[PDB]
Short mmCIF file of C-alpha atoms in Angstrom, two decimals:
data_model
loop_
_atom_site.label_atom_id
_atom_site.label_comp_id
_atom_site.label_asym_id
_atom_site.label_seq_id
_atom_site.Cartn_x
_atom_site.Cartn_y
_atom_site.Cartn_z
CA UNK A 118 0.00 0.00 0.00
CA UNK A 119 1.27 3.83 -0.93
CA UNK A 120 -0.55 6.39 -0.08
CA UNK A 121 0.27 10.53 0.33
CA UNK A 122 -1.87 12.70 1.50
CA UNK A 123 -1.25 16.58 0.97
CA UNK A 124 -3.31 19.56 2.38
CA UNK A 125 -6.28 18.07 3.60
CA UNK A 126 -8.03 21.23 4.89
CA UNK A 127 -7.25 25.09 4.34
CA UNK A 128 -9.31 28.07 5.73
CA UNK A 129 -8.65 31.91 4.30
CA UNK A 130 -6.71 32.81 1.70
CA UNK A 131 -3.07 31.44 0.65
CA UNK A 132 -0.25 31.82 -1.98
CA UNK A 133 1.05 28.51 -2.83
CA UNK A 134 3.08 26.07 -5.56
CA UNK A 135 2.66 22.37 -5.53
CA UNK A 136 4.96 19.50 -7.37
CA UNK A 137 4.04 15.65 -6.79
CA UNK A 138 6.48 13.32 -8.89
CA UNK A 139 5.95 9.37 -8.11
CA UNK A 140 7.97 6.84 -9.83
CA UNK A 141 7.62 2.93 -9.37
CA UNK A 142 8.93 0.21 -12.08
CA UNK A 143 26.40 9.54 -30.78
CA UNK A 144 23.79 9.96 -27.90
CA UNK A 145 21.06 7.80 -26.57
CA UNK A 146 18.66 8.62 -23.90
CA UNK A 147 15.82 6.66 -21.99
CA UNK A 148 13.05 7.06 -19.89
CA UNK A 149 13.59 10.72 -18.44
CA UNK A 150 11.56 13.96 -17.32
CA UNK A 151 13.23 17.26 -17.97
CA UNK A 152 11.37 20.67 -16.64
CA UNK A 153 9.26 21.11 -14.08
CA UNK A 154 9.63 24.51 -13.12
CA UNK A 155 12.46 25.50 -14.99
CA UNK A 156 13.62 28.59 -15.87
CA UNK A 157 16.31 29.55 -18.44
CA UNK A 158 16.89 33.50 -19.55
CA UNK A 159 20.44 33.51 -21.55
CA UNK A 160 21.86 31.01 -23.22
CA UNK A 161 24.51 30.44 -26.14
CA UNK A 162 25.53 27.15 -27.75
CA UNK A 163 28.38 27.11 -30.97
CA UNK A 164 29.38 23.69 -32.13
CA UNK A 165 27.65 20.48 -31.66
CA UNK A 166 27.78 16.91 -32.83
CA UNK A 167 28.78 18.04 -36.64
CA UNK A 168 28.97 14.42 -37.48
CA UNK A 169 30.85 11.17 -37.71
CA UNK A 170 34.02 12.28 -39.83
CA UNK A 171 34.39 15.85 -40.34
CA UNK A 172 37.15 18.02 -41.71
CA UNK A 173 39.46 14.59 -42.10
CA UNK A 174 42.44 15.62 -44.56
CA UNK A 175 44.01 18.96 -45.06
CA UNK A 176 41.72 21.39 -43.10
CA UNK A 177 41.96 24.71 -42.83
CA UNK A 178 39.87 26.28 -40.54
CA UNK A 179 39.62 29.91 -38.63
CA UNK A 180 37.29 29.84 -35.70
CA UNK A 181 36.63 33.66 -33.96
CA UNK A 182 33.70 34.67 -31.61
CA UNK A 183 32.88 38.29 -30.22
CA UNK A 184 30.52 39.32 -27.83
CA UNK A 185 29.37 42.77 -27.02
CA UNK A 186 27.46 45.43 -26.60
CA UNK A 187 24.64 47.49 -24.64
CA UNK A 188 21.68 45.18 -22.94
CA UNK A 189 20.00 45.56 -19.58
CA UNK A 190 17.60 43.11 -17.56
CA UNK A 191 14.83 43.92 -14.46
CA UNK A 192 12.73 41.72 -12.67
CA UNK A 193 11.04 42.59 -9.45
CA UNK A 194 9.71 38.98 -8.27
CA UNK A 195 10.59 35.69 -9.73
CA UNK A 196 9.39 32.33 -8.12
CA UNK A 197 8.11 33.75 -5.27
CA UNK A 198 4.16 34.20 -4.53
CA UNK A 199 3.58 37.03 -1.88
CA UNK A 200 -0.06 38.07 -0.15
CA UNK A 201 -0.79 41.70 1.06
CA UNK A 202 2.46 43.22 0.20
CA UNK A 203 3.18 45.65 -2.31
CA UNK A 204 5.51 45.33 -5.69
CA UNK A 205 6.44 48.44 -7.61
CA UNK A 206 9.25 49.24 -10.42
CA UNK A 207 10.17 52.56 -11.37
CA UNK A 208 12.43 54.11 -13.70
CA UNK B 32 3.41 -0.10 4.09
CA UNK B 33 4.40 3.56 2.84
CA UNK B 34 2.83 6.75 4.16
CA UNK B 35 3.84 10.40 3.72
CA UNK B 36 1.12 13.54 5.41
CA UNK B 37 2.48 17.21 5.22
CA UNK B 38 0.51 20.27 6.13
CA UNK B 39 -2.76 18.77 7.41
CA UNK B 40 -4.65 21.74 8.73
CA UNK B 41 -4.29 25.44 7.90
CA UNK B 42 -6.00 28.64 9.21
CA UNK B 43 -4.59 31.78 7.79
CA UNK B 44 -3.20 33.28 4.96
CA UNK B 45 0.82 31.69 4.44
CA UNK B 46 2.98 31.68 1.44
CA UNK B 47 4.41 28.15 0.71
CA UNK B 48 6.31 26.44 -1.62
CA UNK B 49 6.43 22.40 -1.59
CA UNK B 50 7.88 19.63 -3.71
CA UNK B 51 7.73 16.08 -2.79
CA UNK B 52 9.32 12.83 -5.08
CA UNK B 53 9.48 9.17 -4.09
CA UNK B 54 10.97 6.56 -5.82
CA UNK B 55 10.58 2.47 -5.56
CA UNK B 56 12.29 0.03 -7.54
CA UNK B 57 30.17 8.70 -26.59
CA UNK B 58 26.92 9.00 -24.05
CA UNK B 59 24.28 6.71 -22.55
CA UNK B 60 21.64 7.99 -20.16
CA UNK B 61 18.62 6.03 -18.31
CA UNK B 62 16.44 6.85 -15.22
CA UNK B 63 16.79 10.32 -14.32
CA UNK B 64 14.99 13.48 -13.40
CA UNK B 65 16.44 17.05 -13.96
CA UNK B 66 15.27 20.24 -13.28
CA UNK B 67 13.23 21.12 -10.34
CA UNK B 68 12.91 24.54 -9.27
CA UNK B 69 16.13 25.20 -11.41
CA UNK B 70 17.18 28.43 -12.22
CA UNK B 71 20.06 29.20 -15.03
CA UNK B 72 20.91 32.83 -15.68
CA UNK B 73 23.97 33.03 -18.02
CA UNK B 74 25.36 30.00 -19.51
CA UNK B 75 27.97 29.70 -22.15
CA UNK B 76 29.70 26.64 -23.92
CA UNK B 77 31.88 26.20 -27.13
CA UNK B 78 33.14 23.04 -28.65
CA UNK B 79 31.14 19.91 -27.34
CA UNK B 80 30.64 16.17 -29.42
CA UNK B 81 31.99 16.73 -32.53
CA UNK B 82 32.24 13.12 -33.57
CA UNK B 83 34.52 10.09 -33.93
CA UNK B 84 37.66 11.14 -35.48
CA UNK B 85 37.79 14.95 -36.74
CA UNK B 86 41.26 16.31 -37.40
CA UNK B 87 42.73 13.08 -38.26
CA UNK B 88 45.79 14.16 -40.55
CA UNK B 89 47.91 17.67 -41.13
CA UNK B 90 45.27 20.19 -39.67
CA UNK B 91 45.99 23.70 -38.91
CA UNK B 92 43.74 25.57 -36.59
CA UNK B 93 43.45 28.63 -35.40
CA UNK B 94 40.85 28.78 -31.86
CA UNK B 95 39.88 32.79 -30.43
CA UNK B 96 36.84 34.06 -28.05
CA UNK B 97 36.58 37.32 -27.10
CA UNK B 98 33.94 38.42 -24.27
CA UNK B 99 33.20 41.73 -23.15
CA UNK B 100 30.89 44.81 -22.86
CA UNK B 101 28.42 46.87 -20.72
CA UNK B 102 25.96 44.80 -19.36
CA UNK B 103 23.80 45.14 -16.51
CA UNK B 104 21.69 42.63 -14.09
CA UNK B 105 18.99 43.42 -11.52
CA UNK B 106 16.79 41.16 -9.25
CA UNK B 107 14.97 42.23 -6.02
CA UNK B 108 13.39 38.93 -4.66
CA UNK B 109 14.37 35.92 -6.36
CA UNK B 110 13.12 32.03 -4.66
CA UNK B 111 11.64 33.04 -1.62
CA UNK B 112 8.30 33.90 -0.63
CA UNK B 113 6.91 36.93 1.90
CA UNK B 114 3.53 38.39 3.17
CA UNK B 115 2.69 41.14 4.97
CA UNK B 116 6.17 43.17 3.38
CA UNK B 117 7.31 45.55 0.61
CA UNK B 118 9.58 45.16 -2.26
CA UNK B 119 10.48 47.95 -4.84
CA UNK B 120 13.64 48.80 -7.06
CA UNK B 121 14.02 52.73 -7.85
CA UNK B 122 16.61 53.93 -10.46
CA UNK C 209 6.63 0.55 8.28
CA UNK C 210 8.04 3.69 6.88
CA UNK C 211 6.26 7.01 8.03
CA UNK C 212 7.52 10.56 7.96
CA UNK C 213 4.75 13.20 9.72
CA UNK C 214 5.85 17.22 8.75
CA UNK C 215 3.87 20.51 10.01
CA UNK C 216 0.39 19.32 11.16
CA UNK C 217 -1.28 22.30 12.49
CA UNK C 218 -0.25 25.23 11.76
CA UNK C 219 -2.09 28.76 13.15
CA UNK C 220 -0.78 32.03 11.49
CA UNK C 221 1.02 33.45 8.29
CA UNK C 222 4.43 32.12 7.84
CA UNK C 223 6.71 31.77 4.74
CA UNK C 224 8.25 28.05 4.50
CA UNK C 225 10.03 25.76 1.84
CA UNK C 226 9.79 22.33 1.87
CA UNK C 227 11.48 19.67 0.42
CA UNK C 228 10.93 15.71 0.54
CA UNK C 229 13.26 13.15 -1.10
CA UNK C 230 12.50 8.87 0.22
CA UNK C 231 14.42 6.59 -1.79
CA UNK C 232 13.99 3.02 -1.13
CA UNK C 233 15.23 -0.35 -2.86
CA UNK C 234 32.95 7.81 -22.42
CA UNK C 235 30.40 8.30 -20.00
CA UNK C 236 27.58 6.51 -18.37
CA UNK C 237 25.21 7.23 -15.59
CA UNK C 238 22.13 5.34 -14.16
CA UNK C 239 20.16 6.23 -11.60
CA UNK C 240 20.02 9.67 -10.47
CA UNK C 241 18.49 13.00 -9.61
CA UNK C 242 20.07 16.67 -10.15
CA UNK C 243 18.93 20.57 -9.25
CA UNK C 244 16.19 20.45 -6.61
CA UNK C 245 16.32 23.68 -5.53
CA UNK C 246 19.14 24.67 -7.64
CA UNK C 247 20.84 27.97 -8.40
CA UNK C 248 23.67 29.33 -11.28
CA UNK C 249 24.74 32.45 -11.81
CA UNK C 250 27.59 32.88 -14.52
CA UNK C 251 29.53 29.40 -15.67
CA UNK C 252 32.12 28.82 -18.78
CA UNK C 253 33.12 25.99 -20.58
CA UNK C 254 35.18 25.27 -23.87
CA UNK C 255 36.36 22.45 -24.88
CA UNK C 256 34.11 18.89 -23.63
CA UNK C 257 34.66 15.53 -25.22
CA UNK C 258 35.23 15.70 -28.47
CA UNK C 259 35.65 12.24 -29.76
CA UNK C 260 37.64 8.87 -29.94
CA UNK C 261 40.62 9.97 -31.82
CA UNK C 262 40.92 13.44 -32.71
CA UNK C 263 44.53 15.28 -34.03
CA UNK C 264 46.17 12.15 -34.46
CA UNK C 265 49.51 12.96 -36.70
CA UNK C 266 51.28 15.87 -37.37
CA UNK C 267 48.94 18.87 -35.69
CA UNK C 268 49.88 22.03 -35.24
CA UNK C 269 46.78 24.66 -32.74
CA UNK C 270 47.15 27.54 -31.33
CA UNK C 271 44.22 28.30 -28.50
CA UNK C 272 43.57 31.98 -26.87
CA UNK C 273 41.17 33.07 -24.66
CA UNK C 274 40.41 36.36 -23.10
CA UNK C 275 37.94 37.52 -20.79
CA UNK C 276 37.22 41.50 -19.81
CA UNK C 277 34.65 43.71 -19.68
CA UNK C 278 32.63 46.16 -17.33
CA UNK C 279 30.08 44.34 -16.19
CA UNK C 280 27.23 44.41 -13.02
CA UNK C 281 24.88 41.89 -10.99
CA UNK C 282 23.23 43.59 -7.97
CA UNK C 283 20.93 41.03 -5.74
CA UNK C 284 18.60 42.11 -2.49
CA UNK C 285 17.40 38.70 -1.09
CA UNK C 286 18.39 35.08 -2.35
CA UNK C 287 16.85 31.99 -1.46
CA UNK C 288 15.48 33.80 1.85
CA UNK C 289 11.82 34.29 2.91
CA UNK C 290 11.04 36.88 5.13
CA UNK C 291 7.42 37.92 6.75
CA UNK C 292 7.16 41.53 8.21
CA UNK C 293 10.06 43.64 6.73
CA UNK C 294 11.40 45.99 4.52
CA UNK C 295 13.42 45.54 1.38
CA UNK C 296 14.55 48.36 -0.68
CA UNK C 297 17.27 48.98 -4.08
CA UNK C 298 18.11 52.62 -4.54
CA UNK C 299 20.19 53.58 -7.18
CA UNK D 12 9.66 0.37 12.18
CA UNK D 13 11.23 3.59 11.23
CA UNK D 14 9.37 7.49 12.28
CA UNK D 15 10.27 10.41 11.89
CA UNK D 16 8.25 13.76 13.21
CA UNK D 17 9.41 17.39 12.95
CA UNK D 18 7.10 20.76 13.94
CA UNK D 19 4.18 19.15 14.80
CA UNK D 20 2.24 22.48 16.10
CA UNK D 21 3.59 26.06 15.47
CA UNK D 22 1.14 29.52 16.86
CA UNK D 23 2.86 32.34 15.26
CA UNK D 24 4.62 33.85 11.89
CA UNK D 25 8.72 32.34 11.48
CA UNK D 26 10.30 31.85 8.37
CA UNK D 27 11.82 28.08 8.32
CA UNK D 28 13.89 26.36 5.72
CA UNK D 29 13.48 22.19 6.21
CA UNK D 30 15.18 19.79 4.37
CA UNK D 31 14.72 15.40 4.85
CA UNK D 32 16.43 12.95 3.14
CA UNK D 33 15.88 9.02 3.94
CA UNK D 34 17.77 6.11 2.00
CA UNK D 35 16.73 2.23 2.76
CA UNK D 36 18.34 -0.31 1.04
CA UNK D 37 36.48 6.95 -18.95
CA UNK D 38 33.83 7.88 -16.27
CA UNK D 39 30.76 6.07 -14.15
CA UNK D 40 28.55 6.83 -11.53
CA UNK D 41 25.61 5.33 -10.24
CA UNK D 42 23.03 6.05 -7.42
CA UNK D 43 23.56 9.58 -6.57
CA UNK D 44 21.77 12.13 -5.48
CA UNK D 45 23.48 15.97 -6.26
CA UNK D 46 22.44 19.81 -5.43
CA UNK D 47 19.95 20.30 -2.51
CA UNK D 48 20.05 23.94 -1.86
CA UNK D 49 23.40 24.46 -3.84
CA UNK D 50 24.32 27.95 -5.25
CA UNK D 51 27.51 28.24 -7.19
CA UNK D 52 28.47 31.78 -7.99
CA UNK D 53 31.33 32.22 -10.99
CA UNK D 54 32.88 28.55 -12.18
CA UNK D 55 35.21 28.55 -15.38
CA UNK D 56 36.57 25.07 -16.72
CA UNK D 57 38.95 24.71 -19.53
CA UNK D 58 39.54 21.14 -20.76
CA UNK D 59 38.23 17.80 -19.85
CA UNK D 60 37.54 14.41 -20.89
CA UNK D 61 39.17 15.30 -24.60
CA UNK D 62 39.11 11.48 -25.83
CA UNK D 63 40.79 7.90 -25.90
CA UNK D 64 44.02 8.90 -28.00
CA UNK D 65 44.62 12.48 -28.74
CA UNK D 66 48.34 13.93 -30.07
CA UNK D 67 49.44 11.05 -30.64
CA UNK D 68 52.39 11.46 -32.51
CA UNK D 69 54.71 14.51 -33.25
CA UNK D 70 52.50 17.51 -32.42
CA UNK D 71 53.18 21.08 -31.29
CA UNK D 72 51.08 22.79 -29.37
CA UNK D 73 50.82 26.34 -27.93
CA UNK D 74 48.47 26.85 -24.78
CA UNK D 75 47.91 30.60 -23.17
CA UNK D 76 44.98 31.89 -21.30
CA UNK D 77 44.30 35.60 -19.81
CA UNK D 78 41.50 36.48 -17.49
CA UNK D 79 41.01 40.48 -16.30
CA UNK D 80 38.56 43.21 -16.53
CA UNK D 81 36.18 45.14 -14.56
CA UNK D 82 33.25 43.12 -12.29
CA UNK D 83 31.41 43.92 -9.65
CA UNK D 84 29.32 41.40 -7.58
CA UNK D 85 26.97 42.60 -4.61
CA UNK D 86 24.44 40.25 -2.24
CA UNK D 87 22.60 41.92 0.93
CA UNK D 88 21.16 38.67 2.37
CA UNK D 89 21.90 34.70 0.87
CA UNK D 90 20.41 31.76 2.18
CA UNK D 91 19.75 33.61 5.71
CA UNK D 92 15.91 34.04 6.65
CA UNK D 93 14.66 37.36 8.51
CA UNK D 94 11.51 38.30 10.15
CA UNK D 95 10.83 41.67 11.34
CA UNK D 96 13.92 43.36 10.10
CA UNK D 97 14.99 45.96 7.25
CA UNK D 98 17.17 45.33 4.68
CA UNK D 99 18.76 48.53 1.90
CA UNK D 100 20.92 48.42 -0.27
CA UNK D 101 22.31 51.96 -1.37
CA UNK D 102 24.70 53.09 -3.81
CA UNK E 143 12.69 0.49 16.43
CA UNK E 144 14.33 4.27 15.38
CA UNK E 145 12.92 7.44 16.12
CA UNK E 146 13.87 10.91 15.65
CA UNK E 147 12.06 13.57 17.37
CA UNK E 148 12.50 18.02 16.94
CA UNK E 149 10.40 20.55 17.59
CA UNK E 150 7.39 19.72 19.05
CA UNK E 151 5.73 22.93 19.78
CA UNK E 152 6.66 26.40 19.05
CA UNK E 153 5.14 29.66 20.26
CA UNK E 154 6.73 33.04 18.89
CA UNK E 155 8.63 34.17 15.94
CA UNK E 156 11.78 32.43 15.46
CA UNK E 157 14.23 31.96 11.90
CA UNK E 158 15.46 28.39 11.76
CA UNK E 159 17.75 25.77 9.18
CA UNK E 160 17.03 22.23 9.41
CA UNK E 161 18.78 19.57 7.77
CA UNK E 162 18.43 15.69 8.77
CA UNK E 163 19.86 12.63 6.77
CA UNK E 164 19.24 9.05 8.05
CA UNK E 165 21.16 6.18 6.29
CA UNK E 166 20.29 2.29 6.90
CA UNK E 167 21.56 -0.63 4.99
CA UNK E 168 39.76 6.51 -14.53
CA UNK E 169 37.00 6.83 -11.95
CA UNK E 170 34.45 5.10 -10.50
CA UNK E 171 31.73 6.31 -7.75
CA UNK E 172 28.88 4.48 -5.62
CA UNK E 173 25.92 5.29 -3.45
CA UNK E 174 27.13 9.13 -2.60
CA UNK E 175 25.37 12.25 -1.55
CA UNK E 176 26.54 15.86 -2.56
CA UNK E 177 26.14 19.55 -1.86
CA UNK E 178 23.47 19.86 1.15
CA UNK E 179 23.71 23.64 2.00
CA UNK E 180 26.86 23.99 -0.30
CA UNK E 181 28.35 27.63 -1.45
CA UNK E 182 30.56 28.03 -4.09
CA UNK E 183 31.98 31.88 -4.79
CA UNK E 184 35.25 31.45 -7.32
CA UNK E 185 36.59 27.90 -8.59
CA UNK E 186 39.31 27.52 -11.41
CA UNK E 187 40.56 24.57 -12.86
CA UNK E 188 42.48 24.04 -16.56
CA UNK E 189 43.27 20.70 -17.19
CA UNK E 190 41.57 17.33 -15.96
CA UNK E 191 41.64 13.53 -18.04
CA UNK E 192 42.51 13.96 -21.13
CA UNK E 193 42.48 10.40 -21.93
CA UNK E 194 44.40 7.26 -21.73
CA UNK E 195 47.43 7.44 -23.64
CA UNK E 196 48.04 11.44 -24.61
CA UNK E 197 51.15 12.58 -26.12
CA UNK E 198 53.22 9.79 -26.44
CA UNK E 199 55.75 10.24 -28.68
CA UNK E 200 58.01 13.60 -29.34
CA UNK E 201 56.11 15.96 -28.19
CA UNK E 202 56.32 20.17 -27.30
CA UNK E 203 54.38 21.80 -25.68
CA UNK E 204 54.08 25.03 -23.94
CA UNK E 205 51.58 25.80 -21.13
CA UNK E 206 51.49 29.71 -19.54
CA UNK E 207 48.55 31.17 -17.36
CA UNK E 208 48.32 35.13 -16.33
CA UNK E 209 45.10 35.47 -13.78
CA UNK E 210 44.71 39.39 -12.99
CA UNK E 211 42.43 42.24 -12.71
CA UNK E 212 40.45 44.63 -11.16
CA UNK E 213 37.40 42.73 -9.00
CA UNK E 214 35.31 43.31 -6.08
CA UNK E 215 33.00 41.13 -3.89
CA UNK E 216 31.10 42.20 -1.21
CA UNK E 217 28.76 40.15 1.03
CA UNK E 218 26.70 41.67 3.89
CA UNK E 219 25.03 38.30 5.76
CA UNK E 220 25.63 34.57 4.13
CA UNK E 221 24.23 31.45 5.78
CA UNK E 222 23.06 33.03 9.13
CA UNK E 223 19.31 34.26 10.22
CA UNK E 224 18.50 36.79 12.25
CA UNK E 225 15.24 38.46 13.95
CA UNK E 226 14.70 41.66 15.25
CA UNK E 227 17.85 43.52 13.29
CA UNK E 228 18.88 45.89 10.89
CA UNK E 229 21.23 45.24 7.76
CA UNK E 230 22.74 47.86 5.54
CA UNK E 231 25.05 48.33 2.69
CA UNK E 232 26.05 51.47 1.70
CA UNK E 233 28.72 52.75 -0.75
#
């Protein structure tokens, strides 16, 4: 016998966040969960899995990366519930 | 016999957050979870898995990165809850 | 018998996290769980597996990296609730 | 038989951070568990796991790296809870 | 029989960290646990398994590292609660 038993009874007036996960039994991948409550905001990737035999006799090869430049971010709440409270951006 | 209870009986107004997981019984993977409540904020790779033999005979390479510049971040409440507060970001 | 009892009653607003984990019975891995409650701010990498037999004979690189720049990451709270207060970013 | 009780009754408002774990019974690794409440910050990794048989025979390489610039990192409160308190941060 | 037993009752405000673990039974690992309350500010490393049988025969190489720069950190509370307080940064 399992059982679970969450938040039976609730009186007035929450915030809340609820995860339940139960489990009972070149690349390769099996039987996987990816992403619960995931965040992802900047992210770069170059070069991946060109193939089996690439560039194999005589290469030549020039390989430069810039990065610049004027960028801003702002977030005021992130992932987090509030009640009777006050939030405020200003600029 | 298996038995898990968590927050039975509530009378106000709380901020919560829960998560609960149970478990009975060139790359290879199998049987895995990934990823909760994950954050990533700036994440950067290059060269990764190009295959089974690259560059085998008389290469010539050449390999640069350059990173820079004006860039700006800015979080006030980031993975955790409040009530009853205040939260603001002036500029 | 296996039990585990958490936070009955509760009277009042509070700010919690909770976090449950029962387990009970090139590269490989079997078997596993990764980021529960997981943070990452600024990470690098450049060069990651790149195959069985790679610049055999006769190779001739040349790798560089540089890293500069003005750059800014301002945080108030992390990972912290708090019930009852003040929090404030002036610029 | 195996228990386990924490908080049973709380009358009031605290900020709490709980945490349970319970285990009955080129690279590998099997039956791990990795990051509960883990923060890592600035991380930088340049080489690893490259492959079987690389320069084998007769090569030349050149390796240099340079790391400088301008940062600034700034944190009022991590992984501390607070209840009735102020926190500022001014500039 | 095992039992563990905290914090029955509570009355007031308090700020608390729990943490309890129960346990009842090139590179190889087994049945390991990582990283519970774990901070990580500034971690370098440049060269780790290349493989099995690198540069063998006849080989040059060079290897030079320059770490340097203007960088600032500044922390005002890390890993501890507190109640009833004031916390300030100011530059």
């Amino acid at each position: 016998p399992l059982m679970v038993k969450v938040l039976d009874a609730v009186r007035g007036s929450p915030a809340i966040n609820v995860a339940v996960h139960v489990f009972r039994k070149l690349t390769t991948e099996e039987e996987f969960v990816e992403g619960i409550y995931k965040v992802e905001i900047d992210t770069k990737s170059y070069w991946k899995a060109l193939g089996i035999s690439p560039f194999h006799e005589h290469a030549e090869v020039v390989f430069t990366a810039n990065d610049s430049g004027p960028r801003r971010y702002t977030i005021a709440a992130l992932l987090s519930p509030y009640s009777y409270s006050t939030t405020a951006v200003v600029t």
